[PDB]
Amino acid sequence: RTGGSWFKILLFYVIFYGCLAGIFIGTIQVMLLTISEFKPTYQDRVAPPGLTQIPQSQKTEISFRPNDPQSYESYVVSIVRFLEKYKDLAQKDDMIFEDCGNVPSELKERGEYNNERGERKVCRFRLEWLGNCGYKDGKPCVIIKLNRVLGFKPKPPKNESLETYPVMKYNPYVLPVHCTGKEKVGTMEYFGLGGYPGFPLQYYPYYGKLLQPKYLQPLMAVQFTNLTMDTEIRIECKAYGENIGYSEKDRFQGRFDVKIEVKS
Amino acid sequence: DPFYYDYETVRNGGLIFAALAFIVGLIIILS
Amino acid sequence: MDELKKEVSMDDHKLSLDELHRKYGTDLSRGLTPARAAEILARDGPNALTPPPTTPEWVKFCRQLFGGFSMLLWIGAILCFLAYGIQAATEEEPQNDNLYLGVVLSAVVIITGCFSYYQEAKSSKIMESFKNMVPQQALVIRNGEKMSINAEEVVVGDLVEVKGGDRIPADLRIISANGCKVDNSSLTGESEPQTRSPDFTNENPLETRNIAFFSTNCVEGTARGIVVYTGDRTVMGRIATLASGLEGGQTPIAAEIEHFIHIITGVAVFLGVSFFILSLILEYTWLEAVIFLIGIIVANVPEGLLATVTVCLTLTAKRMARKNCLVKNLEAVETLGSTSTICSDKTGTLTQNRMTVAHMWSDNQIHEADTTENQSGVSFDKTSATWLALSRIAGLCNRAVFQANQENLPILKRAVAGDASESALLKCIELCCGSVKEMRERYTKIVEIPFNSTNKYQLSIHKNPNTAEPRHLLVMKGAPERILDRCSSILIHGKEQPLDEELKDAFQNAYLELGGLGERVLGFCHLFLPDEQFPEGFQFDTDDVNFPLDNLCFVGLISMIDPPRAAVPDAVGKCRSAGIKVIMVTGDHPITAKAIAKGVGIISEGNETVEDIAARLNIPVSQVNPRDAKACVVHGSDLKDMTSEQLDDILKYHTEIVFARTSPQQKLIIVEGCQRQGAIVAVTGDGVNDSPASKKADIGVAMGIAGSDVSKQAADMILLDDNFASIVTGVEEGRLIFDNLKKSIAYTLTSNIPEITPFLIFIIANIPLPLGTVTILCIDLGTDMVPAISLAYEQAESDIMKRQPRNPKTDKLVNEQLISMAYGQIGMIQALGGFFTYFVILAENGFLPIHLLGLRVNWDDRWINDVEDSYGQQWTYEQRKIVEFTCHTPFFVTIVVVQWADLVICKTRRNSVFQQGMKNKILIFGLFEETALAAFLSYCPGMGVALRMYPLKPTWWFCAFPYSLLIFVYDEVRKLIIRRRPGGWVEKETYY
Ligand SMILES: C[C@@H]1O[C@@H](O[C@H]2C[C@@H](O)[C@]3(CO)[C@H]4[C@H](O)C[C@]5(C)[C@@H](C6=CC(=O)OC6)CC[C@]5(O)[C@@H]4CC[C@]3(O)C2)[C@H](O)[C@H](O)[C@H]1O
Ligand SMILES: [Mg+2]
């Protein structure tokens, strides 16, 4: 319990933490000074892209009762949010959109990673491309997505690498997308751009956000119909390509795994 | 493919220098 | 209880030979009946000290968990052993974090124990294989028959016959004794033999000559007495019980330790709860704001500190076993330098307890002999003829002989068959004049008058070896007055000369000078008989006067005393130079006591007692202002009626004190009284009458060889060679290891601030977890284990012997000043270095600082597999995690890089690193290992999983650099200021 010297401590720390805080910020500001606006200095961490799912699955599962309207309001909400973006109303004026090929077209590098030109043009995408996705209760619609990657040029497998059975062969410009779980208790349908079960190589390479605000990435509606309703089923979407890899630890590297159950 | 690191060579390159101080220090303790 | 033992005893030596027999119903010439014998046996018990309650067991391990520190480790590892179960009931996420951490601290306790249990195990055995005491047999008279029996069979009433060589079986009341001396170096601590007569002398059962006390040993002559006290009933016996039956007490070092916790826990709950309220106000349910409070413990409680300190102490103590100083306790290692006042025994401790020829008066000149064990001094003279005529007499008029088979052991250590004085002579001549048996052979003894009680002298008649004047030679020795009373001439420089009243005065000068030095004096003279009144075959009458006894040739005096140790004096001086108060507590007589005192430097030159003054100005006692007497001396007879306030006052106003003729129990009160001042006092004795003082001492210290068993037991330290000078070495090391302990607590606790904050702001700014748990454990026990220990080996930033003993109540081991440096200053710079590396790794990987606020929510979301960076890229769950964990790893490296810096600025306290240079060779190697370790814990094939440690990119390591170097500087500068302004608001604020 010391007195009269309290001001000696206070004044000390004040202008010590004060300068320590100065230096910590100082440096912070400088290392803020050697990284692009346009491109992350390191990307070797996201090497394999990751296939994410719109229906927000608590634990990779979509169990719900057809007989309840609210038994799947949760899966409805989030699937709503992802899609309110792709509105034909959000993207009307060629600024800054471009009605790309109604089908699987070819990619077109829009210059480089500079702000030397304007806002890099952004290919459109119609909510219509995703037929039958109410949403339906019988057989919920589940759309898939590919993770954004600056400079990523997906390269679909050559006609020489393909097994039983990802079809058709859209070697041109499209990333196949099959689904499975033995255990064949399903019936798979895919509502695509062109109708194909794959991504159009007309949307890459994605040019950052800072370079392409309002950019929009492809979608891939995939809902089943004839399925069990008294048991959980284990199905797994998977992407395919040279530029596509998977790991044992990450159960999301270019694939999902969904535990659907339409109990009622 | 500027999306690649030669991690395999820095792992092989650090493990070679942490095994050198491990033995340099064994030269100065056991003197 | 013991209070009964804090008081003088009673006895009945004042009873006539009859009474003592009528009270015990025994016989004086017969001794009681074997029937009355076995009987009085089963009545009380056997004659021995009850089995010492020294039977420990495996359960001892528990004692290693009494230490306040050990408690935290337990309270924590249990408290963090519950966090897992609290969450587990919900979701098994952090099962390696909490669950592991608990087990870790758990096992820690267990090993730390081992280094504490292996200590008091190795020390015992190492001291148990020593000279084992094997009780012998006693000689009793039962039914007029004398026999020998187990000493345990001796009962209160039987006749016991003792001789020269054995020891006192039990407490005796002499009834017969012929020239009987004994050794009271266990009660009075006085080596010089004490005659024993059936006649009572002093009213004090401690001075009477008709009582022999157990545990002693009859030096010479014979005697017989009745047993009045047996077993514990013995005078010295009661002391043993009070010695091994006393309380231990809390050590000094332990005080610092326990106090240190109060401060640690002190903040750990201030932050713990301060951040619990903060968490609430930050939108946190009652299931979280508390699950955090429990959080701020590990971060706040050193896990490796305990195992550190312990390793330190163990080490320092190993450096003392190398200098022949042993210990039984680990805490003791420190006490010796926290000491402010040393209480010392005189005999066996400061001295050697062996009569030795000290001085000689030949050629009207005072000579002085070398008195050390190893004869470190110098010779006096050997040229003068007188010396030879003196050396011959001491060697021939002498009956002492070296025990057989000792040509191996040095002269001063070989046992001798003979009394005190004569052993001394034997040894003294044997040393600087060759074998004495050579003298008793060349000069054959024909007739001699052994030393008579009336005669006061001992003479001999030897056949001269000279082939020229080989005529009967007469030699006698005895009291200086009796010898001079029978002298006509005085061999000076070879040729005889008249006993002038001039030299009958210069002998009266020496005899009173050597005597005043508390030394025993012997006078020597010889005579060359007239070969006319004595033929070649003359027969001498030892019973009648057949030869000349008067008018002999005086040759010289020689004196002897209980010389001190080798370096005892030089040693004591050291401690005084350090500011340690030296106090002699001996049960000896003032005369000799005060003597050895001025000889060892407990009492310096020019200082005086109230009495000394009284003698000089020739005034009464009660006329000298006590305050002018810086020294004094106190007889135990004066203390008996002294109230503690008086002793208090005696210790306050004097600087050089000598409590003499004190009873064991007084030692106790003296020590106590010194402690009552608040001082740290150490007791160093050998005689069993020292235990009660040595066990009550903050730290006791015993004499290995000459020390008795029970003092060794109640003692905290063992000098194996009795080298006092180790003591100095002891306090030095004690003071050195003290500071270096600070420096290590510093280093360690500094590491703490950059371990906590990452988990604090995590909750305040909602950013991903900068530092993971598995990480912290790779510092507090990974890299921050070597450096710390290395700090044990720092030297002194100055001469420490040159400074006063620390004030135990004021200069704590972990004071608030050291807190505000590691916590409020250095750790802070160590923290910022930590975060700098943080934002770097994230930024270069696409997550700017700004965007990092409030991310944790979604970040730690294990569903969102598309969280968006500041570049618009999208990350899965595991991918961004691999960055978090790779953001853990460098925070870990980065720390290490600031522990480079801390480790150096902590190697010193006031001296610049340039001044103290880099002598420490361990501290060096630690950097390399501390580093090599981090490096390894990174680029290890699999560690990425076993410890979620991922490799670091080139540009990674150099993230802390600019900070680490800042630290180095900030401290070097600060210390330069402390040096320039030794006030001060710079030193008394920051100076640990
Ligand atoms: C915001 C918070 O974030 C996640 O949890 C966080 C809090 C809590 O859960 C834990 C585990 O219990 C904490 C724990 O409590 C405290 C720690 C023992 C702490 C230490 C202090 C120390 O001194 O050394 C170690 C540092 C990490 C720690 O080892 C774990 C790390 C995993 C974590 O999981 C992290 C979850 O997502 C959670 O649900 C959400 O509430
Ligand atoms: Mg003694």
Task: Give one DSSP letter per residue of C230-257, joined into a string.
Answer: -GGGSHHHHHHHHHHTS-----HHHHHH
Task: Please state, in angstroms and rounded to a whole number, the distance separating the CA atoms of residues A204 and C121.
Answer: 75
Number of H helices and E strands in chain A, helices first, is 2, 11
In the beta sheet, which residues pair with residue A260?
Answer: A62, A233
Task: Please state, in angstroms and rounded to a whole number, the distance separating the CA atoms of residues A189 and A179.
Answer: 10
C686 a known binding residue? yes
CA C711 / ligand 2 centre spacing (Å): 10
Task: Please state, in angstroms and rounded to a whole number, the distance separating the CA atoms of residues C360 and C433.
Answer: 15
Which residue has a Cα nearest atom 16 of ligand 1?
C295
CA C688 / ligand 2 centre spacing (Å): 7
Question: What residues contact residue A125 under an 8 Å CB cut-off, 6+ apart?
Answer: A86, A193, A203, A216, A218, A219
- Is residue C884 within 8 A of residue C953, CB to CB? The reply is no
Ligand 1, residue C772: give the atom nearest the CA.
27
Same domain, C530 and C607: no
Ligand 1, residue C93: give the atom nearest the CA.
34
Among left, alpha and beta (phi > 0; psi -120 to 50; other), residue C289 is: alpha
Residue closest to C672 by CA, chosen among C38, C6, C150: C6
In the beta sheet, which residues pair with residue C220?
Answer: C181
Q: Which amino acid is at C722?
A: D
Q: Does C776 sit in the ligand 1 pocket, CB within 6 Å?
A: yes
Task: Please state, in angstroms and rounded to a whole number, the distance separating the CA atoms of residues C564 and C569.
Answer: 8
Half-sphere exposure of C175 (CA within 13 A, CB side): 23
- Ligand 1, residues C73, C79, C93, C104: which to mutate, most atoms within 8 A of Cβ? C93
Residue closest to A256 by CA, chosen among C266, C865, C313: C865
Ligand 1, residue C80: give the atom nearest the CA.
18
Question: What residues contact residue C149 under an 8 Å CB cut-off, 6+ apart?
Answer: C137, C138, C140
**CB A151 to CB B2 under 8 A?**
yes
Task: Please state, in angstroms and rounded to a whole number, the distance separating the CA atoms of residues C898 and C394.
Answer: 76
Q: Does C752 sit in the ligand 1 pocket, CB within 6 Å?
A: no
The tokens for B26 are 């064994």
Inform me whether the C-beta atom of residue A44 falls under 8 Å from chain B C-beta atoms. Answer: yes
Does residue C826 have a cis bond before it (omega within 30 degrees)?
Answer: no
- Which SS3 state, helix, strand or coil, does residue C952 take? coil
Tokens 């040509």, residue? C407
Q: Which amino acid is at C551?
A: N
Which stretches does DSSP call E strand in A9-140?
52-53, 61-63, 97-98, 122-123
The tokens for A28 are 């912070």
Same domain, C530 and C675: no
Task: Please state, in angstroms and rounded to a whole number, the distance separating the CA atoms of residues A85 and A91.
Answer: 9
Residue closest to C475 by CA, chosen among C542, C400, C393, C388: C393
Rounded to 10°, the helix C725-750/C305-321 angle is 160
CA C292 / ligand 1 centre spacing (Å): 8
Three-state secondary structure readout of C253-318: HHHHHHHHHHHHHHHHHHHHHHHHHHHHCCCCCCCCHHHHHCCCCCCCCCCCHHHHHHHHHHHHHH
Instruction: Give burial (CB, 10 Å; 0-12/13-18/19+) of A63.
Output: middle
Q: What does residue B10 show for φ and ψ, rounded to 5 degrees? A: -85, -30
Cα of first residue to Cα of last residue in chain A, in angstroms, is 72
CA C694 / ligand 2 centre spacing (Å): 12
The tokens for C182 are 């004994």
Which residue has a Cα nearest atom 26 of ligand 1?
C773
Q: Which amino acid is at C520?
A: R
Q: Does the residue C342 lie in any domain?
A: yes
Task: Give all chains having 3 or more CB-to-CB distances under 8 Å with chain C.
Answer: A, B
The helix (H) or strand (E) run that includes residue C989 is helix C987-990
The tokens for A65 are 């009762």
Same domain, C600 and C533: no
Half-sphere exposure of C509 (CA within 13 A, CB side): 11
Which stretches does DSSP call E strand in C662-734?
681-685, 699-703, 717-719
Which residue has a Cα nearest atom 38 of ligand 1?
C860
Give the length of chain C.
992
Task: Please state, in angstroms and rounded to a whole number, the distance separating the CA atoms of residues C651 and C670.
Answer: 9
Three-state secondary structure readout of A137-193: CCCCECCEECCCCCCCCCCCCCCCCCCCCCCCCCCCCEEEEEEECCCCCCCEEEECC
Cα of first residue to Cα of last residue in chain B, in angstroms, is 50
In this complex, which of A17, A32, A253 lies closest to C876 when CB atoms are compared? A253
Strand C325-327 to C717-719 pairing: antiparallel
Q: Does C553 sit in the ligand 1 pocket, CB within 6 Å?
A: no
- Is residue C979 within 8 A of residue C971, CB to CB? The reply is no
- Ligand 1, residues C287, C291, C773: which to mutate, most atoms within 8 A of Cβ? C773
Q: Does C358 sit in the ligand 1 pocket, CB within 6 Å?
A: no
Cβ atoms within 10 A of the Cβ of C991, count? 18
DSSP C310-361: HHHHHHHHHHHHTTTEEES-TTHHHHTTS-SEEEE-IIIIIB--S-EEEEEE
**CB A47 to CB B3 under 8 A?**
yes
Contact list, B4 vs chain A (CB under 8 Å): 44, 47
In the beta sheet, which residues pair with residue A180?
Answer: A236
In the beta sheet, which residues pair with residue C325?
Answer: C719
Number of H helices and E strands in chain C, helices first, is 38, 26
In this complex, which of C849, C877, C985 lies closest to A8 when CB atoms are compared? C985
Q: How many angstroms separate the Cα of C208 from the Cα of each of A107, C169, C204, C664, C893?
A: 121, 18, 6, 18, 78
Residue closest to C351 by CA, chosen among C690, C655, C706: C706
Does residue C457 have a cis bond before it (omega within 30 degrees)?
Answer: no
**CB A250 to CB C876 under 8 A?**
yes
**CB C954 to CB B10 under 8 A?**
yes
- Is residue C602 within 8 A of residue C583, CB to CB? The reply is yes
Strand C699-703 to C717-719 pairing: parallel
- Is residue A4 within 8 A of residue C985, CB to CB? The reply is no
Same domain, C222 and C145: yes
Task: Please state, in angstroms and rounded to a whole number, the distance separating the CA atoms of residues C571 and C582.
Answer: 11
Which stretches does DSSP call E strand in C565-710?
581-585, 634-635, 657-660, 681-685, 699-703
Strand C681-685 to C699-703 pairing: parallel
Task: Give all chains having 3 or more CB-to-CB distances under 8 Å with chain B.
Answer: A, C
Q: How many angstroms separate the Cα of C756 from the Cα of each of C296, C307, C574?
A: 7, 21, 47
Inform me whether the C-beta atom of residue A214 falls under 8 Å from chain C C-beta atoms. Answer: no
Q: What does residue C31 show for φ and ψ, rounded to 5 degrees? A: 80, 150
DSSP state, residue C385: H
Task: Please state, in angstroms and rounded to a whole number, the distance separating the CA atoms of residues A173 and A101.
Answer: 11
Task: Please state, in angstroms and rounded to a whole number, the distance separating the CA atoms of residues C282 and C35.
Answer: 92
Q: Does the residue C266 lie in any domain?
A: no
**CB C940 to CB B28 under 8 A?**
no
- Is residue C586 within 8 A of residue C662, CB to CB? The reply is yes
- Is residue C841 within 8 A of residue C886, CB to CB? The reply is yes
Instruction: Give burial (CB, 10 Å; 0-12/13-18/19+) of C455.
Output: middle
Residues with CB under 5 A from ligand 2 (ion): C 189, 345, 347-348, 686-687
The tokens for C735 are 């003071």
Same domain, C146 and C215: yes
Contact list, A150 vs chain C (CB under 8 Å): 871-873
For chain A, the C-alpha Rg in angstroms (whole number) is 24
- Which SS3 state, helix, strand or coil, does residue C784 take? coil
Q: Does C783 sit in the ligand 1 pocket, CB within 6 Å?
A: no
- Which SS3 state, helix, strand or coil, does residue A98 take? strand
- Which SS3 state, helix, strand or coil, does residue C430 take? helix
CATH classification number, A39-264, choose in 2.60.40.1660, 3.40.630.30, 3.30.420.40, 3.30.360.10: 2.60.40.1660
Cβ atoms within 10 A of the Cβ of C687, count? 31
Task: Please state, in angstroms and rounded to a whole number, the distance separating the CA atoms of residues C361 and C369.
Answer: 11
Cβ atoms within 10 A of the Cβ of A60, count? 16
Contact list, B3 vs chain C (CB under 8 Å): none
- Which range of residues forms the domain containing residue C107? 58-127
- Is residue C226 within 8 A of residue C140, CB to CB? The reply is no
Q: What does residue C759 show for φ and ψ, rounded to 5 degrees? A: -105, -10
Give the length of chain B.
31
Task: Please state, in angstroms and rounded to a whole number, the distance separating the CA atoms of residues A71 and A69.
Answer: 6
Q: Does C299 sit in the ligand 1 pocket, CB within 6 Å?
A: yes
DSSP state, residue C809: T
Instruction: Give burial (CB, 10 Å; 0-12/13-18/19+) of C112.
Output: buried
Task: Please state, in angstroms and rounded to a whole number, the distance separating the CA atoms of residues A119 and C52.
Answer: 95
Contact list, A46 vs chain B (CB under 8 Å): 3
Q: Give the catalytic positions of C in this structure.
A: 345
Question: Whose atoms come closest to the Cα of C667: which ligand?
Answer: 2
Strand C325-327 to A198-200 pairing: unpaired
Cβ atoms within 10 A of the Cβ of C479, count? 15
Three-state secondary structure readout of C33-48: CHHHHHHHHHHHCCCC
Question: What residues contact residue B1 under an 8 Å CB cut-off, 6+ apart?
Answer: none
Question: What residues contact residue A248 under an 8 Å CB cut-off, 6+ apart?
Answer: none
Biggest alpha carbon–alpha carbon distance for chain A:
85
DSSP state, residue C705: T
Domain boundaries of chain A, sorted by first residue:
8-37, 39-264
Q: Does C357 sit in the ligand 1 pocket, CB within 6 Å?
A: no
- Which SS3 state, helix, strand or coil, does residue C841 take? helix
The tokens for C103 are 């087990």
**CB A250 to CB C843 under 8 A?**
no
Strand C552-561 to C356-362 pairing: antiparallel
- Which range of residues forms the domain containing residue B20? 1-31
As for how many domains chain B has, the answer is 1
Strand C445-449 to C457-462 pairing: antiparallel
Q: How many angstroms separate the Cα of A7 from the Cα of each of A2, C131, C139, C403, C819?
A: 11, 66, 84, 80, 19
Q: How many angstroms separate the Cα of C33 from the Cα of each of C27, C148, C149, C417, C580?
A: 9, 15, 15, 35, 59
DSSP state, residue C102: H
- Is residue C724 within 8 A of residue C798, CB to CB? The reply is no
Q: Which of residues 895-954 of C touch B (CB under 8 A)?
A: 921-922, 924-925, 928-929, 931-933, 935-936, 938-941, 951-954
Which stretches does DSSP call E strand in C450-546?
457-462, 473-478, 487-490, 520-528
Same domain, C140 and C121: no
Inform me whether the C-beta atom of residue A151 falls under 8 Å from chain B C-beta atoms. Answer: yes
User: In degrees, to the nearest 5, what angle opens at C-alpha C863 toward C-alphas C859 and C864?
Assistant: 55
Residue closest to C422 by CA, chosen among C484, C477, C380, C460: C477
The tokens for C749 are 């606790």
The tokens for C577 are 């130079």
- Ligand 1, residues C82, C95, C97, C881: which to mutate, most atoms within 8 A of Cβ? C97
Q: Which residue of B has its CA nearest to C951?
A: B11
Instruction: Give burial (CB, 10 Å; 0-12/13-18/19+) of A93.
Output: exposed
Q: Does the residue C703 lie in any domain?
A: yes
Task: Please state, in angstroms and rounded to a whole number, the distance separating the CA atoms of residues C877 and C867.
Answer: 8
DSSP state, residue C4: G
Ligand 1, residue C299: give the atom nearest the CA.
23
Task: Please state, in angstroms and rounded to a whole number, the distance separating the CA atoms of residues C961 and A246.
Answer: 38
- Is residue C690 within 8 A of residue C667, CB to CB? The reply is yes
Q: Which residue of C has its CA nearest to A54?
A: C864
Same domain, C99 and C177: no
CA C186 / ligand 2 centre spacing (Å): 6
Q: Does C298 sit in the ligand 1 pocket, CB within 6 Å?
A: yes
Same domain, C547 and C583: no
The tokens for C789 are 């220990």
Residue closest to C335 by CA, chosen among C250, C407, C395: C250
Q: How many angstroms separate the Cα of A32 from the Cα of each of A7, A29, C563, C846, C848?
A: 36, 5, 81, 11, 8
In the beta sheet, which residues pair with residue C765?
Answer: none
Q: Give C464-471 contacts, CB < 8 A, sequence gap 24+.
A: C469/C528, C471/C528, C471/C529, C471/C531, C471/C534
Report resolution in angstroms: 4.6
As for how many domains chain C has, the answer is 5
DSSP state, residue C364: T
Ligand 1, residue C759: give the atom nearest the CA.
26
Question: Whose atoms come closest to the Cα of C707: which ligand?
Answer: 2
What CATH number has the domain bearing residue C717?
3.40.50.1000
Instruction: Give burial (CB, 10 Å; 0-12/13-18/19+) of C19.
Output: exposed
- Which SS3 state, helix, strand or coil, does residue C143 take? coil
Q: Does the residue C740 lie in any domain?
A: yes
**Structural method:** X-ray
Q: What does residue A137 show for φ and ψ, rounded to 5 degrees? A: -95, -45
